[PDB]
Design a protein around this ligand. Structure first.
Ligand code: HEM
Ligand code: OCT
Length: 472
């Protein structure tokens, strides 16, 4: 016991000593910066800090843990190109929920899984998914036409979430109620876990699970685990009749190691972790992305009208979009990237340096130091983006992006730990969002504007309330 107290106090002095090269905002004697972080709009407060301290600034939860918040393309590249492990202080809070899956793994075992699961987001696996996206969206759009003609605005986030979760499971988990029960549990898990990240008194494992906060997290963990245990058994059992006919495997079948070709033999815990992991990752983010996009289309009726007639032309007289049609959606894509710049679905990720790093401006950090990549501020950096807060899709035209720094716009991160599902996501969001524009015209609700709420992914304190006009 005495050993551990000392272990921590030295680590904090170390972390502090390594960022003395980095000025930053004032620290409360107990809370560090937590009182600023916990305020509504703290993302914009970090953006102002960005302009007062260039490249990076220290960031403390509560006097024991301090990160170097980084928000500059060279600083990002210096760190996120290399593959240092995920910050244990943050990602260990995943353990009771998603465990040591791909997101949290740190080393040669991560590369094994990454090598195993990358096939499965290859475009030959994703080509059939286009039909499924279209079907899932048509169900959601059927409900929205009833809501629209009621004349009231309504929150689209939960509806998109239920559609995202359903399409994920039809595409990658074998699916051909209790699902809603899972959806509500993710909400609790991400809410609670985000609050744990921001609340230093909840950091210690032993203490945390004596608190109502931690117990509530554990009840949601069980709720999540029941869901993924059912998904696994349902598939294992469905492969008694249909194994011959499927044999380019989808994600869950790869894990189940049909054909014995994977040759890595996953444990039951490792299998359940990856299912847990990709079940959070493959729906929560695209829910945020799609929802925030449709809001952007409402905020800027010129841009969505352009997107609408673009996809209207691409579709023509087809029944549904084909995988080949997704490339033609060049203007939809640029509006989407500009949405993700301002409304990045994952605002903040973290690493713990395994090796020292030296930055472009001369400063450096030793191994063991904690990094906080602030994608939100990075995407609003005034030294990189003229008129940062302005929404201009033409920033991502072929001309204006030709010589842009590679780590300037990284909503899917970058490097060896980049998003594995990026092309899954991009394909899904383009199909969903294109069919949304062919079917409705979206407009703000001036009384109920969204307020940004970090919740691991980017959510809104009050949903995304929109008015929908049906279309011929
Ligand atoms: C799983 C999964 C990973 C981890 C890959 C690995 O560790 O090999 C992943 C990564 C990311 C990251 C980096 C996370 C970090 O730095 O801690 C970001 C920022 C991000 C963002 C988005 N992702 Fe993702 N992603 C994983 C899974 C998925 C899936 C699953 C099928 C989809 C779909 C997807 C989509 C998106 C997305 C879409 C709007 C954003 C933003 N990710 N991912
Ligand atoms: C610390 C938040 C990590 C969220 C990553 C989600 C990847 C889809």
């Amino acid at each position: 016991g005495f050993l551990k107290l000392l272990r921590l106090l030295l680590r904090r002095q170390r972390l502090a000593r390594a960022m003395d090269s980095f000025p930053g905002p004032p620290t409360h004697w107990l809370f560090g910066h937590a009182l600023e972080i916990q305020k509504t709009g703290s993302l914009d407060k970090v953006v102002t800090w960005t302009q007062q301290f260039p490249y990076a600034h220290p960031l403390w939860v509560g006097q024991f843990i301090g990160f170097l918040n980084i928000y500059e393309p060279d600083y990002a590249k210096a760190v996120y190109s290399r593959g240092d492990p995920k910050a244990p202080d943050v990602y260990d809070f995943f353990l009771q929920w998603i465990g040591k899956g791909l997101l949290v793994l740190d080393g040669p075992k991560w590369f094994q899984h990454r090598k195993l699961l990358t096939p499965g987001f290859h475009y030959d696996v994703l080509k059939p998914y286009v039909a499924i996206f279209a079907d899932s969206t048509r169900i959601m759009l059927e409900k929205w036409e009833k809501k629209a003609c009621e004349g009231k605005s309504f929150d689209i986030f939960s509806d998109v979430g239920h559609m995202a979760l359903d399409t994920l499971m039809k595409c990658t988990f074998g699916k051909g109620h209790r699902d809603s029960s899972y959806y509500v549990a993710v909400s609790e898990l991400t809410l609670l876990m985000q609050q744990r990240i921001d609340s230093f008194q909840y950091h210690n494992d032993f203490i945390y699970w004596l608190t109502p906060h931690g117990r509530r997290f554990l009840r949601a963990c069980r709720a999540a685990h029941d869901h993924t245990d059912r998904v696994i058994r349902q598939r294992k059992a469905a492969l008694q009749d249909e194994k011959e006919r499927e044999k380019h495997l989808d994600f869950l079948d790869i894990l189940l190691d049909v054909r014995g070709e994977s040759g890595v033999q996953l444990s039951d815990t490792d299998l359940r972790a990856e299912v847990d992991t990709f079940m959070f990752e493959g729906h929560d983010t695209t829910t945020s992305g799609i929802s925030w996009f449709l809001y952007c289309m409402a905020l800027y009726p010129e841009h969505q009208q352009r997107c609408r007639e673009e996809v209207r032309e691409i579709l023509g007289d087809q029944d549904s979009f084909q995988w080949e049609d997704l490339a033609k959606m060049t203007y939809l894509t640029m509006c989407m990237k500009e949405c993700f710049r301002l409304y990045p679905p994952v605002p903040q990720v973290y690493r713990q340096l395994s090796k020292p790093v030296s930055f472009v401006d001369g400063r450096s950090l030793p191994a063991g130091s904690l990094i906080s990549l602030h994608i939100y501020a990075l995407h609003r950096n005034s030294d990189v983006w003229p008129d940062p807060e302005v929404f201009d899709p033409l920033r991502f035209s072929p001309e204006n992006s030709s010589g842009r720094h590679p780590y300037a716009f990284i909503p899917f991160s970058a490097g060896p730990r980049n998003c594995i599902g990026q092309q899954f996501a991009m394909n899904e969001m383009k199909v969903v969002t294109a069919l949304c524009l062919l079917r409705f015209e979206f407009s703000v609700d001036p009384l109920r504007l969204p307020i940004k709420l970090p919740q691991l992914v980017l959510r809104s304190k009050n949903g995304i309330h929109l008015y929908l006009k049906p279309l011929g």
